[PDB]
Design an enzyme around this catalytic site. Structure first.
Site, PDB file in Angstrom:
ATOM      1  N   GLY A  73       0.757  -1.230   0.053  1.00 24.37           N
ATOM      2  CA  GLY A  73       0.158  -0.095   0.051  1.00 24.37           C
ATOM      3  C   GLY A  73       0.696   1.344   0.069  1.00 24.37           C
ATOM      4  N   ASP A  74       0.198   2.499   0.077  1.00 24.63           N
ATOM      5  CA  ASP A  74       0.628   3.899  -0.237  1.00 24.63           C
ATOM      6  C   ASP A  74       1.695   4.168   0.938  1.00 24.63           C
ATOM      7  OD1 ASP A  74       0.357   6.445  -1.834  1.00 24.63           O
ATOM      8  OD2 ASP A  74       0.052   6.897   0.487  1.00 24.63           O
ATOM      9  N   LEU A  75       1.140   3.865   2.329  1.00 25.03           N
ATOM     10  CA  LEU A  75       1.914   4.173   3.446  1.00 25.03           C
ATOM     11  C   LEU A  75       3.243   3.677   3.471  1.00 25.03           C
ATOM     12  CD1 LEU A  75       2.494   5.783   5.989  1.00 25.03           C
ATOM     13  CD2 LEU A  75       1.488   3.773   7.028  1.00 25.03           C
ATOM     14  N   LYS A  77       4.674   1.813   1.191  1.00 21.96           N
ATOM     15  CA  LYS A  77       5.930   2.027   0.081  1.00 21.96           C
ATOM     16  C   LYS A  77       6.518   3.283   0.302  1.00 21.96           C
ATOM     17  CE  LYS A  77       3.070   3.289  -3.865  1.00 21.96           C
ATOM     18  NZ  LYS A  77       2.380   2.553  -4.976  1.00 21.96           N
ATOM     19  N   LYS A 212      -3.349   5.482  12.349  1.00 18.00           N
ATOM     20  CA  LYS A 212      -4.655   6.116  12.646  1.00 18.00           C
ATOM     21  C   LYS A 212      -5.555   5.778  11.392  1.00 18.00           C
ATOM     22  CE  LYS A 212      -2.913  10.387  10.758  1.00 18.00           C
ATOM     23  NZ  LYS A 212      -4.014  10.610   9.600  1.00 18.00           N
ATOM     24  N   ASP A 299      -8.547  15.272  12.088  1.00 12.83           N
ATOM     25  CA  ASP A 299      -7.569  15.236  11.283  1.00 12.83           C
ATOM     26  C   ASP A 299      -6.123  15.372  12.278  1.00 12.83           C
ATOM     27  OD1 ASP A 299      -5.907  14.736   9.362  1.00 12.83           O
ATOM     28  OD2 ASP A 299      -5.864  16.421   8.278  1.00 12.83           O
ATOM     29  N   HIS A 304      -2.969  15.027  17.298  1.00  8.07           N
ATOM     30  CA  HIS A 304      -1.718  15.406  17.559  1.00  8.07           C
ATOM     31  C   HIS A 304      -1.689  16.654  18.312  1.00  8.07           C
ATOM     32  CE1 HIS A 304       2.527  16.594  16.710  1.00  8.07           C
ATOM     33  NE2 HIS A 304       2.293  17.389  15.873  1.00  8.07           N
ATOM     34  N   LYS A 440      11.060  35.087  24.692  1.00  7.03           N
ATOM     35  CA  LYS A 440      11.271  36.574  24.539  1.00  7.03           C
ATOM     36  C   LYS A 440      11.226  37.156  25.794  1.00  7.03           C
ATOM     37  CE  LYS A 440       8.267  36.002  20.620  1.00  7.03           C
ATOM     38  NZ  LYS A 440       6.970  36.851  19.714  1.00  7.03           N
ATOM     39  N   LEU A 462      17.208  28.792  23.666  1.00 11.00           N
ATOM     40  CA  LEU A 462      17.124  27.961  24.844  1.00 11.00           C
ATOM     41  C   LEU A 462      17.805  26.543  24.388  1.00 11.00           C
ATOM     42  CD1 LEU A 462      14.016  27.967  26.609  1.00 11.00           C
ATOM     43  CD2 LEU A 462      15.851  29.651  27.112  1.00 11.00           C
TER      44      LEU A 462
HETATM   45  N1  NDP Z   1       0.551   8.659   4.140  1.00  7.26           N
HETATM   46  C1  NDP Z   1      -0.299   7.610   4.266  1.00  7.26           C
HETATM   47  O1  NDP Z   1      -0.714   7.041   3.529  1.00  7.26           O
HETATM   48  C2  NDP Z   1      -1.049   7.759   5.875  1.00  7.26           C
HETATM   49  C3  NDP Z   1      -2.022   6.448   6.018  1.00  7.26           C
HETATM   50  N2  NDP Z   1      -2.230   6.247   7.614  1.00  7.26           N
HETATM   51  C4  NDP Z   1      -3.043   5.119   7.984  1.00  7.26           C
HETATM   52  O2  NDP Z   1      -2.026   3.931   7.605  1.00  7.26           O
HETATM   53  C5  NDP Z   1      -2.679   2.992   7.113  1.00  7.26           C
HETATM   54  C6  NDP Z   1      -2.180   2.442   5.698  1.00  7.26           C
HETATM   55  O3  NDP Z   1      -2.595   3.773   4.889  1.00  7.26           O
HETATM   56  P1  NDP Z   1      -2.544   3.712   3.328  1.00  7.26           P
HETATM   57  O4  NDP Z   1      -1.469   2.649   2.838  1.00  7.26           O
HETATM   58  O5  NDP Z   1      -2.553   4.832   2.689  1.00  7.26           O
HETATM   59  O6  NDP Z   1      -3.813   3.061   2.967  1.00  7.26           O
HETATM   60  P2  NDP Z   1      -4.348   1.753   1.711  1.00  7.26           P
HETATM   61  O7  NDP Z   1      -5.698   2.164   1.167  1.00  7.26           O
HETATM   62  O8  NDP Z   1      -3.369   2.001   0.636  1.00  7.26           O
HETATM   63  O9  NDP Z   1      -4.364   0.209   2.167  1.00  7.26           O
HETATM   64  C7  NDP Z   1      -2.889  -0.424   2.595  1.00  7.26           C
HETATM   65  C8  NDP Z   1      -3.145  -1.724   1.887  1.00  7.26           C
HETATM   66  O10 NDP Z   1      -4.023  -2.382   2.948  1.00  7.26           O
HETATM   67  C9  NDP Z   1      -4.650  -3.330   1.921  1.00  7.26           C
HETATM   68  N3  NDP Z   1      -6.234  -2.811   2.007  1.00  7.26           N
HETATM   69  C10 NDP Z   1      -6.900  -1.887   1.690  1.00  7.26           C
HETATM   70  N4  NDP Z   1      -8.285  -2.062   1.956  1.00  7.26           N
HETATM   71  C11 NDP Z   1      -8.165  -3.355   2.475  1.00  7.26           C
HETATM   72  C12 NDP Z   1      -9.329  -3.984   3.132  1.00  7.26           C
HETATM   73  N5  NDP Z   1     -10.747  -3.487   2.987  1.00  7.26           N
HETATM   74  N6  NDP Z   1      -9.179  -5.218   3.645  1.00  7.26           N
HETATM   75  C13 NDP Z   1      -8.125  -5.754   3.331  1.00  7.26           C
HETATM   76  N7  NDP Z   1      -6.804  -4.918   3.000  1.00  7.26           N
HETATM   77  C14 NDP Z   1      -7.087  -4.034   2.607  1.00  7.26           C
HETATM   78  C15 NDP Z   1      -4.135  -3.367   0.633  1.00  7.26           C
HETATM   79  O11 NDP Z   1      -3.365  -4.313   0.524  1.00  7.26           O
HETATM   80  P3  NDP Z   1      -3.534  -5.542  -0.194  1.00  7.26           P
HETATM   81  O12 NDP Z   1      -4.839  -5.542  -1.070  1.00  7.26           O
HETATM   82  O13 NDP Z   1      -2.225  -6.252  -1.046  1.00  7.26           O
HETATM   83  O14 NDP Z   1      -3.750  -6.717   1.056  1.00  7.26           O
HETATM   84  C16 NDP Z   1      -3.739  -1.984   0.688  1.00  7.26           C
HETATM   85  O15 NDP Z   1      -2.615  -1.823  -0.334  1.00  7.26           O
HETATM   86  C17 NDP Z   1      -4.349   3.415   7.356  1.00  7.26           C
HETATM   87  O16 NDP Z   1      -4.600   3.002   8.508  1.00  7.26           O
HETATM   88  C18 NDP Z   1      -4.053   5.230   7.258  1.00  7.26           C
HETATM   89  O17 NDP Z   1      -5.412   5.698   7.641  1.00  7.26           O
HETATM   90  C19 NDP Z   1      -1.911   7.335   8.513  1.00  7.26           C
HETATM   91  C20 NDP Z   1      -0.723   8.171   8.058  1.00  7.26           C
HETATM   92  C21 NDP Z   1      -0.381   8.648   6.788  1.00  7.26           C
END
Ligand code: NDP
Ligand code: NDP
Lengths: 543, 534
Positions: A73-75, A77, A212, A299, A304, A440, A462
């Protein structure tokens, strides 16, 4: 012989080509050919070996396995694997560390995924691509389901074989699971770990990093905590806030509690007002529809800024142990009455006056008529001996005038004897756009023309200035290091999370019921004028 | 040219080395940079004085103008004020002494100008400044001579090109205090300001007596002639910069105001150190001693300003009121709270011992060194040790206030230590706090800390303290001058101890010139609440 030299050659060629590819896919050059040439020549001109293993002997005495669920997923990689790469280069992972990406996505060619997908987001490959190939030898991929007893038995057999091949004193192995997954998957995968992939009885801790959102109100968050607690206790769960860096936390804790000067004035007898501010110039950047169901308070403020507040406002912990600090975070948050809508001003940004930033509602993924707040300022009241009557102002905004995150404490003015020749002292703790901490204060003006009543305001730094300006590791990377070290200080505990949601949920309900509606403000301004009036009405004084 | 280029370079780098090694900053690189820009740093005189300062004639009369202080310090200080444009353009200066001067112009040129600071810049102004100087040969105890002096002052006041009548008169007693009552009676009877207008102020030199009784007799001898708005008892060492650091940094700021008390402060040290000895002039130090020389007067004034309550206003006499009030809370110093020293020859013989001076009576027990504890018995300060230390021929020239705050034992324990606030006057002005800070970097968990110096001001090793006080007298600002009631309270703090010393009840311990002093003094300091940093 020939074998060794030729495998070394292909290895060096492939290592160079992997860096080139990763630079091309990141830099998106219009002329791939031209780009590959300049990069190759510059790589030639640049001797990169920097990995001093700096972990403590605790860390390398037992096997360590890091399992990243959701690795596709996005986070994962873009942030998690590159943070692990940085820790690797800083010498902060055990030399035998094993890293397993786990996801449902089929990957017919795991080495290609490692070298073309993951490596693309490794930062600074000009001087560190050498280390990138070494790092990737620690990474494997398990294609599996989060809800399969059998898959987790199979994963456990994979982990056990690496653990049992460890060359080191202790047996078993430590296990860090990272849930880079939507929260809707957490309960199922925690059940799977608990059933099938806990550490060997012969030795090792387990830690699980939870991402989160942690619910979206008191009820939903408590349900998720209740869903996870039959599987992991609070020494095992690590609920992470990427934005809360070690440097700001230590500025907050050490500068006060180590020092008589600041400990003595950290109270309502001396402090007139406290503001905690999180400002961004970017808007929601085409992802407005995702933001629309979250809003600025969920958010960044309930999570935070509230943790920053708890560390700022807590009583002295019984020791510097993490759970003693988390105890005091909980204690002070319980002194806060739920925020009322009369103590909140909401904004929603419109197009910038120069047209460079379109308005929030102009995003086609944002529902028509949305009243989602992109800006909020609010007052929290801490009802205890130390803080009673001190306004605590939280402010967060998208699409405002500057990128800026700081704490600003105003001290009560000394009216006598200097009068108009002095003003409130201030203490500022800044995280963005750069770290700073300063007071200050009013000082004499040097020279003979200046009598006693002639003064000016000066900023006393400081911070400790080291001899060399050493690398700044980012907040996120220091938190993963903290989880590896077993330090939960900067992570939200289960009881702490519940108290924080109870401070904010009534307000969030009133917002969703339509009881308070955001004021438009143009992107690039400070926000609604009513917000600065609110701040002025709640104890803040201009310089 | 090149050997001189190398000479300039080596000189710059010598100063930087001394600068960096005194500050000892961990960031050597940026301190070197800014201190280099700082070291990079004639001309006609612009007047800097207020319009009211040049509204009336001004005459400055230096009694004892034949003497060591006048020629070496007082006239050169007036010269420095003149060059800085702090004297009104038409000021007249008159030396008055018993010494016959057959040829006044040569006395001014061969004697007075010799000791003017030849900053090469100012040099162009010396003959200009000398045109403001005349000499009256007279007696200090002659009413008729002071009537004659008055006629000469009037001739100069009446030359003034300004609408305001009369003239301001600053009388400077650069004389032994045994002559003060005589001069003051003569001024009263013969040379007070013209009735049409002008103030009179009188600068009085130390010693202001040598104990409660002798000081009170001198104050009683002068008070029929001049009141406390006219008398200026000067302490050359109390510069305006240190006093403003003491008053403004505390009272303008909540942060410092709130911790300036016994709840937060563990120990206060006020220290005056010199590497020089009595320099063959020990014979007339011998009847004074280090306590009367610099501790009962200079250090005690610093103490009063540090320890006073908030004044009703920043007006001079409200501050002096508070100096008096806090001095009245101080217990008379006990002999058990005082360690004395007397310096012997340096280990290398470079510095001869105090008694090796031929002008020092054999077997003298005069102290050249003293450390002592004072107790301030009031709500703000009860229990807080106040340590005064002064010494000749010790290891460095250094003058500072060091405040140590009570350690926060919890929760940092050995990873923290006492905060400090330092206000330094010598060898250069500095003011800084020392606190425990985090160490940047992932290597440092919460317990990895550093004792960090935070400079509010830091100057490298500009009218001096003395000139600033002469200017204060001309401006009518009595803040840094000891008042009659203030002076009496100060002597009552010290006089029992001084009487015990004069009857032999404690005797100085020898210490080699160049050392810190007697080892017993540092034992005493450690026994009275002081803790070593790191
Ligand atoms: N920059 C970011 O992206 C941020 C994200 N977060 C939190 O981090 C976590 C990961 O975020 P992000 O990578 O963007 O999310 P994604 O939508 O990209 O999901 C991550 C991976 O989880 C699997 N996935 C998605 N939906 C499902 C589902 N219903 N059931 C099972 N697997 C699923 C998929 O992998 P596969 O299908 O291969 O199993 C997907 O590639 C989330 O909780 C996000 O709220 C918070 C901080 C920053
Ligand atoms: N560096 C210094 O010298 C310092 C000295 N002081 C104090 O400053 C004052 C002047 O210091 P200094 O110049 O060294 O003292 P001096 O003893 O040298 O006296 C200065 C002048 O006063 C006259 N004088 C001396 N004794 C008598 C006397 N019994 N009766 C009348 N006149 C006398 C003499 O002038 P004439 O015969 O011509 O009338 C002498 O030249 C003193 O009070 C001293 O304690 C404090 C600061 C520093």
């Amino acid at each position: 012989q020939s074998h060794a030299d030729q495998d070394a050659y292909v290895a060096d060629v492939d290592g160079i080509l992997d860096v080139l590819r990763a630079q091309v896919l990141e830099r998106k050059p219009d002329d791939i050919f031209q780009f590959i040439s300049k990069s190759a020549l510059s790589l030639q001109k640049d001797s990169c070996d920097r990995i001093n293993c700096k972990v403590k002997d605790e860390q390398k005495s037992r096997a360590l396995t890091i399992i990243v669920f959701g690795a596709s997923g996005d986070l994962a990689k873009k942030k998690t694997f590159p943070a692990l790469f940085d820790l690797y280069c800083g010498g902060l992972l055990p030399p035998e560390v094993n890293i397993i990406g786990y996801a449902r996505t089929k990957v017919d060619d795991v080495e290609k995924w490692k070298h073309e997908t993951l490596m693309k987001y490794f930062s600074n490959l000009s001087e560190r691509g050498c280390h990138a190939e070494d790092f990737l030898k620690h990474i494997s991929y398990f294609c599996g389901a989060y809800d399969s007893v059998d898959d987790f038995k199979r994963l456990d057999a994979v982990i056990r074989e690496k653990e049992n091949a460890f060359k080191g004193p202790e047996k078993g192995g430590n296990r860090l699971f990272y849930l880079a997954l939507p929260p809707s998957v957490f309960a199922s995968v925690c059940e799977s770990i608990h059933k099938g992939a806990m550490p060997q009885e012969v030795g090792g801790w387990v830690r699980v990093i939870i991402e989160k959102p942690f619910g979206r109100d008191t009820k939903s968050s408590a349900e998720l905590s209740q869903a996870l607690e039959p599987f992991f206790d609070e020494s095992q769960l690590y609920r992470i806030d990427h934005y809360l860096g070690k440097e700001m936390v230590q500025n907050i804790i050490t500068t006060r509690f180590a020092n008589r000067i600041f400990s003595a004035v950290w109270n309502a007898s001396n402090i007139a007002c406290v503001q905690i501010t999180f400002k961004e110039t970017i808007g929601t950047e085409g992802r407005g529809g995702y933001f629309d169901n979250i809003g600025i308070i969920r958010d960044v403020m309930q999570n935070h800024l509230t943790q920053i507040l708890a560390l700022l406002a807590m009583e002295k912990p019984r020791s510097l142990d993490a759970e003693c600090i988390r105890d005091e975070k909980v204690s002070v948050l319980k002194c806060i009455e739920p925020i009322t809508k009369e103590n909140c001003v909401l904004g929603q940004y419109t197009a910038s006056a120069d047209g460079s930033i379109p308005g929030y509602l102009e995003d086609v993924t944002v529902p028509e008529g949305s009243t989602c707040p992109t800006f909020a300022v609010m007052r929290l009241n801490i009802n205890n001996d130390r803080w009673a009557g001190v306004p605590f102002i939280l402010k967060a905004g998208k699409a405002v005038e500057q990128k800026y995150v700081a704490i600003r404490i105003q001290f009560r003015d000394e009216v006598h004897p200097y009068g108009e020749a002095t003003q409130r002292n201030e203490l500022v703790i800044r995280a963005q756009p750069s770290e700073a901490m300063y007071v200050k204060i009013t000082t004499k003006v040097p020279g003979l023309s200046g009598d006693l009543r002639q003064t000016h305001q000066t900023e006393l730094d400081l911070t400790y200035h080291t001899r060399y300006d050493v690398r700044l590791p980012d907040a996120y990377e220091s938190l993963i290091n903290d989880a590896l070290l077993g330090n939960s200080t900067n992570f939200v505990r289960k009881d702490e999370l519940d108290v924080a949601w109870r401070i904010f949920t009534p307000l969030l309900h009133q917002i969703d019921s339509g009881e308070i509606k955001p004021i438009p403000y143009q992107a690039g301004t400070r926000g609604p004028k009513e917000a600065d009036e609110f701040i002025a009405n709640n104890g803040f004084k201009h310089q």
